[PDB]
């Protein structure tokens, strides 16, 4: 019944608003800088980076540590949103942990896209804005840590998804079932099947003239996979480049190579 699917869509949206403080609707309002109830401070050079302390170790390193702390926050929020996904908390515990461990990064970049345009990315809850170029011009083991994310975002943001869309889509991502090592795949897939039905009907109703958006959205899951693998291997470079650099354990746990 389509009415049951709309109610799951409503449920996940509601829970998405409660778990993610910076929605895409907010992010866009801040970025489309004429709804200026509060506009961001813009970091485009090392000069503004210091003035950013006045409003909102090595430069690229502590840029990287701040990006790192934010990932911990995002994982926390994603973990909270997952629990609201019906059936998720009744799966085997080891699989719950496995679904998060692999799903978290794919979600982080889906939602990072909402904070991006071609020119840069919102930071500090939308109080700041770092330009693509300032990042791209960081020192070589850090200069390229965000460019593929910018590349994905512009492609992803062209589908014009709104938060109610994304809520269902990031639920589809967690409840995958092809994650390495799942003890009990079939109940995952029954959940995901219901999420996909939810997503299908949501995309149809919310975007009636956007042909095969559903398919175009699922296809985007290959772009996400590649970005994650690109990311983990640049992380292991930096681990050997600076054996004095430290990585949050919640992030370490998620990072098991191979
Ligand atoms: C940036 C650098 C390093 C990591 N990491 O060690 O996992 C993560 C990030 C990153 O993408 N942070 C982030 C997540 C969500 C929103 C803004 C920034
Ligand atoms: C939404 C808060 C983001 C603050 C993290 C600062 C660096 C973020 C990044 O470069 O991706």
Author numbering: 207 to 262, 275 to 476
Question: Which text from the study accompanies this structure?
Answer:
Thiazolidinediones (TZDs), also called glitazones, are synthetic agonists of the peroxisome proliferator-activated receptor gamma (PPARγ) nuclear receptor with potent anti-diabetic efficacy in patients with type 2 diabetes. Overall, the structure of the PPARγ LBD is described as a three-layer helical sandwich fold composed of 12 α-helices containing a dynamic or flexible internal ligand-binding pocket. The PPARγ ligand-binding pocket is among the largest in the nuclear receptor superfamily, ranging from 1200 to 1400 Å3 in crystal structures with three branches described as ‘T’ or ‘Y’ shaped. Branch I is located proximal to helix 12, which forms a critical part of the activation function-2 (AF-2) coregulator binding surface; branch II is located near the β-sheet surface, close to the predicted ligand entry/exit site where helix 3 meets helix 6 and the helix 11/12 loop; and branch III is also located near the β-sheet surface but deeper in the pocket near helix 5.
GW9662 is an antagonist that covalently binds to C285 located in, and blocks ligand binding to, the orthosteric pocket. We solved two new crystal structures of PPARγ bound to GW9662 and SR16832, an analog of GW9662 that we developed with a ligand extension that weakens synthetic ligand binding to the alternate site, at 2.29 Å and 2.73 Å, respectively. Similar to our edaglitazone crystal structure, we observed electron density consistent with a bound bacterial MCFA in both structures, which we modeled as C9. In chain A of our GW9662-bound structure, one C9 is present within the branch II region of the orthosteric pocket; in chain B, there are two C9 molecules present, one in branch II and another closer to the cobound position in our edaglitazone structure. Despite this limitation, chemical shift perturbations were observed for residues near the crystallized C9 binding modes observed in the GW9662 and SR16832 crystal structures, including residues on helix 2b/β-sheet surface such as I249, L255, G258, L340, G344, G346, and M348, confirming the crystallized C9 binding modes. When PPARγ was preincubated with GW9662, the fatty acids similarly caused a concentration-dependent increase. In support of this hydrogen bond network, we performed density functional theory (DFT) calculations, which revealed a net attractive interaction between C9 and the SR16832 methoxy group (10.3 kcal/mol) and a repulsive interaction with the phenyl moiety of GW9662 (8.56 kcal/mol).
